[PDB]
Assembly symmetry: D2
Homo-oligomer: 184 residues x 4
């Protein structure tokens, strides 16, 4: 029988963070941000496409009159890997000067690209600029970035899910799972 | 006392569709799409930024190895209003030729811009092209568009929430609500 | 001695069209277009980056109150080659509805991508849409495109110059030349 | 008689810089750059759409194996005026790290946007970064920018031509002229 077992879940070796754990953490972070940004001009900026799930969940967990925007970027080649420099394919449309920007990330590891985007956004004179990520791989750090809000710290395993892909697949997994080596 | 009442919920006159109703409908639609697209090469394409909430929820409710992509568009002026013609600010990166594309929309009313995007995507030779929207205002139709999957049909009220904005605000409301006229 | 001979001209096997021939043809075409578009709402649209030299020269040879705009595109992969389908990286900003658009091309060979862009522009309802190219390789045609204005017809040789590149180089040659096989 | 006098030249009050003067200056600057960048990895980067005429002419006057690229930008509103901050609509595709970049400008007045783009390009680690402009209005300066190559210094008159527009018109004038106040 050459039938298939199509569910993306079949390609996962183990679940590191469950859907419920993600849901609870998003609620937690959102309540914190609601308190911290009262009276502020909050703009959530996420980097497509990995940030979509966390952006959606986190924003709905923040009880404030915030705005949302996105950046779409691409690599210049054997340069983005060691410097974190990226090309802008879609820039944010909201004028962030004098506003309180919160970068919303899916995962932070080397911190190289994040540091580069941080400097680019700072160049637009926001009143404040902070960072929030649902996942962090501290052991992978190659640059100094301050993570103001962090969901979960995990080891450097090959993960996918909740927006994180592998060749554009697995973003729709409702949890963070370790991808079976046979797939990569 | 000049204190404020910052919650975006305070600007809502009435809730048309609750968070729970949205959650249940997304689960329902996702289970249907999971069945209908088994064996297909599913690519969900949403139009930023309104489609973010529905895209996130619907994708996670589809138990298939799908890919996600986005389009970011803008108006040409007093032309997009009567023809639905739009400028492409961010095109999709995934090659959809020979694939099964499902347009994911936040709301469909006139259907003008949707019809225009549909024709543009058809020009890229996908194997199939369907449309799914969480909200539909049938009375507003100005063009003939077939909605393959539809969450809720609503009257032509001024709504915001679940990704739908008013001057970039209210996208983070977890429900679909009618905006108080004082705000617009 | 390992000294170099840096001039891009050293990489040319033969000159097919001289700088003077190009200059005279641009003047000729511009005078024709000046006559044909009197009273029209002329918008010259070129595809970056190859069209830059011809766009600059042709526009300055047209004695009419025209506007200029550009499209920047990219390939989707093993699809643009047989269908001419392309991704839009930079769309034109000018609203061309009801206007008289003249596509300005560097070279036309298969006509596949040109045909695709033509259909895309027609979708924006211009009053008229014509095509002008400085170079044409008729033997390479794979689609039916009408060239309203044409500078020179040439055999299918490997050419560069006057905006036409090879790995981003040679666009600055003031003539159309055949590239030495050793370079490609 | 309600006949028109369509030539863009009819809207010019006086010619500040003739076509021949521009041609000679472009030849001059190009010969200088040819000498200065021998052995360098020259990348000319211009800001659309005003830089098109000068980019075309200057590049063809440089006898070196250079590459050309462009940036397309937009304003964020009442912010770009005092800070020079701009949104990126089209970023350059060439990786400029370790390369010798020459910004090619149509006109420099306040220097605000130029200074902002300069900082953005420096962030991509080019080996060297210089600036070349065909026109300069020194009295308009609001920021400190070093112009390595300059064609002509002019008073702060309302000019158009050689790529410089007024409501998208006049870019095709072969000279730099003062626009009649009746048109603006
Ligand atoms: Ca599998
Ligand atoms: Ca990311
Ligand atoms: Ca309120
Ligand atoms: Ca929409
Ligand atoms: Ca050589
Ligand atoms: Ca071309
Ligand atoms: Ca006039
Ligand atoms: Ca400029």
């Amino acid at each position: 029988r050459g039938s298939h077992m199509p569910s993306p879940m079949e390609d996962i070796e183990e679940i590191l963070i469950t859907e419920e754990q993600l849901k609870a953490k998003v609620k937690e972070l959102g309540e914190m941000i609601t308190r911290d940004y009262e009276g502020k001009d909050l703009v959530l900026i996420g980097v497509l496409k990995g940030a979509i799930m966390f952006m959606s969940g986190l924003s709905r967990a923040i009880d404030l009159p915030l705005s949302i925007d996105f950046l779409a970027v691409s690599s210049y080649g054997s340069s983005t890997k060691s410097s974190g420099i990226v090309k802008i394919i879609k820039d944010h449309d909201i004028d962030i000067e004098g506003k309180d920007v919160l970068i919303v990330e899916d995962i932070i590891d080397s911190g190289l690209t994040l540091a580069y985007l941080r400097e680019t956004l700072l160049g637009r004179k926001p009143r404040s600029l902070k960072i929030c990520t649902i996942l962090d791989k501290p052991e992978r750090r190659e640059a100094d970035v301050k993570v103001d809000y962090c969901g979960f710290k995990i080891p450097d395993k090959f993960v996918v899910g909740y927006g994180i892909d592998y060749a554009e697949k697995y973003r729709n997994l409702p949890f963070i799972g370790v991808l079976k080596p046979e797939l990569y």
